[PDB]
């Protein structure tokens, strides 16, 4: 039962998440089942992680095959899956200069690697955006622009200046010849699927390039083809100096990556960084499978098509509680006219849909890329009642 | 070929590890095979991670079963394997007070969690040991006692004082009523399997208790029964406030944990920490299988027995290059009378054995706990020629 599982949680887990309201038992595709037998359509994908849903045969085959071949070895040894995965990610980035890859286990670790890269420029000033989320480790938490999550842990590593997201003049004013790097999400996910103004990422690329600063794009949430290009920044035709990936990279298995382009790719020399589990064969094999399915099933182009019809469908409702829909592909935010997103999260759950109240007035969707249009259509048809009940 | 694999590595990988000298293709138990078909006895376990070796049936079964049931969900949802793993780990720690668990993906992340815990004491001063290794992210790197690895990324999070490992009075002088926490490895692994004097951890527990500081024990490398007790600190009859685990926790799959005891277990409140992949069902299922096998096959006791026999056999060789053997159970250092450990690593490789030059004069062993006594016997008999060729 759900009550017993929550009691077991509260007896042993640290309370850094609160107590989960539901206990999940099984999942298949975009449908999960709780321990009481209720089914839910998963419009959140474990916070954009389950790009291929649950029990995808290609991921299961890749992981089972690799476990029965060769597991963890450490980076004292070269192994094929990590090398092939690095090759595939470099090809997908499509940069004009040599690109090199560092693997790790999480988005926070990927941004820690980028943070350390920034130190090797000889500069210590960093710029990020108010409300950005880059991770919860000491370095990535300094880049995160969420004071409630930072203040109890001060002092954090320096020297970070936060500016308004999407404000070109504010960014130009903050970046100078002492700036090691600028960190930006192409769409701010955790804060409410905040999409920047047209031209902003191109401006950021120009500002940083003129000032000798690295441009680091955090694609941990916007990557893996979710927005209809493999990297969301590719919609703007720019090439950053550093890109970080995690979440959906492994289809559920823990893996992150830091990609560095041109001179930034040579900053890390032997002995200056590492991670025991980074690039291990099983997790890399999972990520290779995800890339293969994305390509074979055309799921990147599909995410744009599904995301456009979903966005159109929500706006066509004309519900008075919805101010606007924003985002791109299958990263979508329903911005509300009143702070009822947490209530709508609960009433969606009553209706069999898993969504996220990313802000008091924003409902975030990040469904599996294998989700059926029919399942999305069903959510849109259910949404007027969900929102009515929310108030 | 090995040359082709190394050439591919050098074309795509960041150079933070250098280029691995061999490329591994498969593994089974304590034997790994490179891309040219050569087999090696794995006396390092991918740096103490492969506790049950490669292709352990129990781990394969747990992972394949869980992948076909429910994958990643995030901590927005309660799931059985993580709760069960937290229960099992709290049982193995056996603390008198309530113990709570936080899951993450790595040793660095587990010590980052402990670092953030220490902030919630209201103090910002921290103490660690010269040459200690606690990870390579910005917070854990501040704790790591290696100035050569810290200097290029300064400034690091503060305020950390380092003292000589095993020195009771240096520790007592450094710990005061402003000290948030003391971080110690029960045996310093990465620096050369450095064992502290008798009573030292007990003194650290008394010093921290009298000054109101947390004692944090990093069991990332010394845990998982490797030393003949599940946690190495249990040989000393102390209970720390915080314990961190990773490496072998998942038998190969990436998972780490921070355990906190008593008042320290209540410091983290909702929203103050998290990790997207932490506690995910597949890695937790793997870790549960490792715990089951350690218990059912009596591998903790076996580690002590085999470790004693191994140490005795190396010291019986009477080889002039061997000063002494130190460590406990199956974490061993061969301390040499001259700095030939790096050369001995290569000549051991020629003889078909994977070992680690942890220091210029220390060969580190951390074999799978399922290693065959005959595989160890063969290593001991081969060691004289390995060392002779090294010189």
Author numbering:
A (entry chain B), B (entry chain A): 7 to 397
Sentences from the paper on this structure:
The L-arginine biosynthesis pathway consists of eight enzymes that catalyse the conversion of L-glutamate to L-arginine, appears to be attractive target for anti-Tuberculosis (TB) drug discovery. The arginine biosynthesis pathway consists of eight different enzymes ([Fig fig1]) all considered to be essential for *M. tuberculosis* growth *in vitro*. In this work, the ligandability of four enzymes of the pathway ArgB, ArgC, ArgD and ArgF is explored using a fragment-based approach. In conclusion, using a fragment-based approach, we have discovered inhibitors that bind to novel sites in ArgB and ArgF and to the active sites of ArgC and ArgD, which in case of ArgB show on target activity against *M. tuberculosis*.
The first crystal structure of the ArgD holoenzyme from *M. tuberculosis* obtained ([Fig fig3]) showed that the protomer has three domains: the smaller N-terminal segment (residues 7 to 74), the relatively larger C-terminal domain (residues 286 to 396), and the central PLP-binding domain (residues 85 to 273), which is also the largest and has a Rossmann-like overall fold ([Fig fig3]). (a) X-ray crystal structure of *M. tuberculosis* ArgD showing the dimer. ArgD contains the prosthetic group PLP that does not leave the active site of the enzyme. Therefore, all the PLP sites must remain occupied during screening experiments to represent the native state of the target. While ArgB and ArgC do not have a human orthologue, ArgD and ArgF do and the *M. tuberculosis* enzymes have identities of 36 and 41% with the human orthologues, respectively.
